[PDB]
Write a protein that binds this DNA or RNA. Sequence first.
DNA 1: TGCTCGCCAC
DNA 2: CGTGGCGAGC
DNA 3: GGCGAGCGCTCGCCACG
Lengths: 590, 588
Amino acid sequence: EFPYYLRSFLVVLKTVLENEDDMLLFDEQEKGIVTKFYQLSATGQKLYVRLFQRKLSWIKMTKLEYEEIALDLTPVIEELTNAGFLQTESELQELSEVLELLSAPELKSLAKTFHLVNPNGQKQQLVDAFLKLAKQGIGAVILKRAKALAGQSVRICKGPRAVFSRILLLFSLTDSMELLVNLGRMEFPSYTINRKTHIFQDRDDLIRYAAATHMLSDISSAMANGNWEEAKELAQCAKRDWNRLKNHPSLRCHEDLPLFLRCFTVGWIYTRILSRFVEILQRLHMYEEAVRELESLLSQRIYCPDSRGRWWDRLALNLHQHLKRLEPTIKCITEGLADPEVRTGHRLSLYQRAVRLRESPSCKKFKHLFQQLPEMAVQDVKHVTITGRLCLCSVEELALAHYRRSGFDQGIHGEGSTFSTLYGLLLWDIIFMDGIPDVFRNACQAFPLDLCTDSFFTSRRPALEARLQLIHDAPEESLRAWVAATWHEQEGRVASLVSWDRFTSLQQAQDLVSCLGGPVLSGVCRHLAADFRHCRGGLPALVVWNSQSRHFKLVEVKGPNDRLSHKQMIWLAELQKLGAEVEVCHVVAV
Amino acid sequence: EFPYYLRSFLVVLKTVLENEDDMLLFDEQEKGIVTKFYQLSATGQKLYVRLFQRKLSWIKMTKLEYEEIALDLTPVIEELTNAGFLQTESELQELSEVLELLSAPELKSLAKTFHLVNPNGQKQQLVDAFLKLAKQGIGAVILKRAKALAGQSVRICKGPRAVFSRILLLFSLTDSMEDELLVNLGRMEFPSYTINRKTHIFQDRDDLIRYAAATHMLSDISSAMANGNWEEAKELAQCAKRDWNRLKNHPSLRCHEDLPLFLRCFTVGWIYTRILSRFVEILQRLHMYEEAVRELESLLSQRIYCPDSRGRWWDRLALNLHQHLKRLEPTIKCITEGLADPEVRTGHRLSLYQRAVRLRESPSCKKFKHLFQQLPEMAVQDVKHVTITLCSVEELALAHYRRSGFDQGIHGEGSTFSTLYGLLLWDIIFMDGIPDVFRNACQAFPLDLCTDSFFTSRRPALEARLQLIHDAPEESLRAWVAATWHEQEGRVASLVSWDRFTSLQQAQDLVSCLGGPVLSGVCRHLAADFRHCRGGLPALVVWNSQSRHFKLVEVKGPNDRLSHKQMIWLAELQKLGAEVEVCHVVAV
DNA sequence: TGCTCGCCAC
DNA sequence: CGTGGCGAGC
DNA sequence: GGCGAGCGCTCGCCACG
């Protein structure tokens, strides 16, 4: 009677409409459109939302079926059309739009009808042949005959759609760079909402934000399908639209935001776009151009500081191998090493490349450029080998089976989620504490907005310092009981850090915290609090333990062609320093 | 002083009364009613007809205004009541009947009176609330209070009304299903022919009555559908469906099967078949494609009624399976049986074939290849399309061709050619000696017009006239047209639009441009297959009156697409050497 | 084919 | 001020 | 041709920056 998708859509509208500063990002005609939506019948509201969730494009009216709403949708379509929310095929005026709507057999059929050569050609080829054929006019005729085949067709009008689209964005900004159906059914974590800052300066700021989003979505799509040439041109235009925008007043206010909010601005999105542009240029072998763009990204310090390590490291790689330019390479590593935002994984990666360069014929002469190098070296781990199966049932599953043979009856393979879940269970009320401005912006967040930022720790330092000492010296019964508290009071609530299914039971989690002990846990929680983005990624694939003796090993698992990455090497050593027993398990090919 | 509606009503009575066998389809009291009507006063006759043309429903006497009948209608009402033609509110005893008679203020007023919750509700909601409330009776009280509001009121008595109703039907059978007696009657001059009865259409008085009630039901259902009342339309059809199978092998049907096709359309079974055919459209509007298909298979499983419709049926059946149902092999079977069926005329045939080609040529259907082997190679040629950028979509096209040098032009659709056909072949279309096509003096067309036997019954005269037209020089064409025009202008023929041409001269100029071969071709198609020919003809005919260049144009705006029939006829005209075009108007 | 719009005697 | 929710007429 | 109704959308009022 009152279905989930509508309920969830109604919640979102209510929230955004409630907030006056958000409403300042719409002009009067746009506000009027939301009003008009509210004026629609309930059957009208249902159809619009079912169409708004669909791909923005025409759909066949005989494929519309929502029996619970109306047996025959025609008069509802009519209402939505009269109100300016939907169009019918009367407004189908682009040949490409209609050619996009037709299936393959149909397109083929139409092709034979017009005596189109090579009709067996793939859809893009057919569409292009028709369109070219129209450039002999004839286009109008191909159009009408296609529409006859399509039958009655409807599309959401793009004006109103983009309004709701930007409202969506405003409601959940952290999903933009990451609609979700389950919303009616998911239980969210507890916290008190506390909003303090305007994120978007104005209507136009939102619109530029939205267009950046769609571009990023376009480019991503192209890359996924191996269309790197198309991906490049779209990126180059996007690149042009960004420089053509840098000048705008709203950016000045974005630059004033702390990092964990700054990620929800137009500029941050284009920076992400530029970062993918780097990968695209390389796939296309344009290593020269990739390098200037990298130097450009690295020359500014407002956006994506978290990414700098990835950038420096790729820049060096392109110089060292792609460009073979040895002295700027050394320069790069030294600046990179000097960059305080680079976390230890990429740092180790950069250094490792310096050593490599300082020790081959190529670089004997530049000896005086290598003096600044710190002697940051990383400890040795214990290494075993096992045989594989296949060409593979999951490497990790094979490892797990072997350690169960070696007397480790318990074992988990959540990667970073293992520890991050324990972190979550031990520090829940601090992660979600009140008094920290702007970290909670709606009641449907899975995490504080500053979580993956340096200011997470600095903003909760007193509480964090007191909790980490309390864990470090906590008795085993304390550890188990703290975990149980959070587990019992929060189980099911959706927290991005926590995997409610990672452990088979509270008891398993209690047994694990007992084996790890307070000192280790404290060490791990400190690193995650202090530097979450970097820390989360280098954690061992596996934890296995003997439930009687509480002997445990934290295992990184490596098949053929699999080798420790820099981050993983930095973390295995750190764990080893906390006295935890660590191992690298290699599966060998069968 | 003697108005059209009465004149026309008098003609209808005259015609039916004239035929003694038709009069046998009423009993004595019913005949007596018609006598009493003729007994009724001239002011009386006027009021009765004005009320007979209204819905069968109560009317307030204080809402009656007909100064042309009487300044005070009270005694006229009284005459009609005493004679048993109207009933007054003394016989108003049904709650629903009275609740249907009240307007909005009144229903609201009554609502306050009985302490109804929401007297501000809409009328139908109030009517329904009162009627439910009456299901507790208290009906009598709601009735009297409603009548107090209505005032003095009358309704046409249903017995006598149904007699006149069947008389009307007998006069003009092709008005009965028309929805899916006419006014001029005193003033229209009808074509010449000889009156010719040879078959009884109705086996008995009862068969006629069942026929008439089927007609009214079909008319009811059709009305509902037209208003988008598809749910009510469905129920009505379901009942009608029940009444037909409830009757099926009844004695009267045997005699209906004996009738030639052009009378068979005036029998109960044919009407229910039409009803079931609307049933198909209803089920599809309701998306009930499963149920639609059994009904189609059922209508196609009998071959006594509506062979004209078989093409529509086959084609819809194929589409429903091919789309939505997606059941590929029976679809192919269906199309092939359809294509095999000699009743299917060329428009739907083309439509069926088109669908076969589509199915025969996609990966989904490679395997069924052995089911396509019988396929005849009936193909229809591709025509040329031009485009230009409301006002008059037809009017815009007309203006454009005037700019392109075609100073004359007619937005005539099929009536343009059908009118020319009429003017060139009138005396043969209406020639004497052909049994059963002319049954009374008030027909607008021969009864066999829409039937196979139209052509076969006039074949020798047609063959000789079509050859004569094929070789006719301009001057012959102009002269023949003028002859018929001058001797028949004004006569009501359904084929002929006396206003389609601006003048005789325009029609003569057009026949001069078309020439004999084209005209011959057109007349042959219309004679051979009139129903199908009439519908597919181009929206426009435009011509240059000096050079006699003409173009036949079909016009398509946004959301406007060539139908199968139109594609078949553009090709045919092109084959006769006429220049044809499809003109698309694109949005500005 | 736009279109806001639904019938009832003339 | 400027804005837009927002409740009575054609 | 007559309208009997339905009925969804402007114009002012207030609040809220």
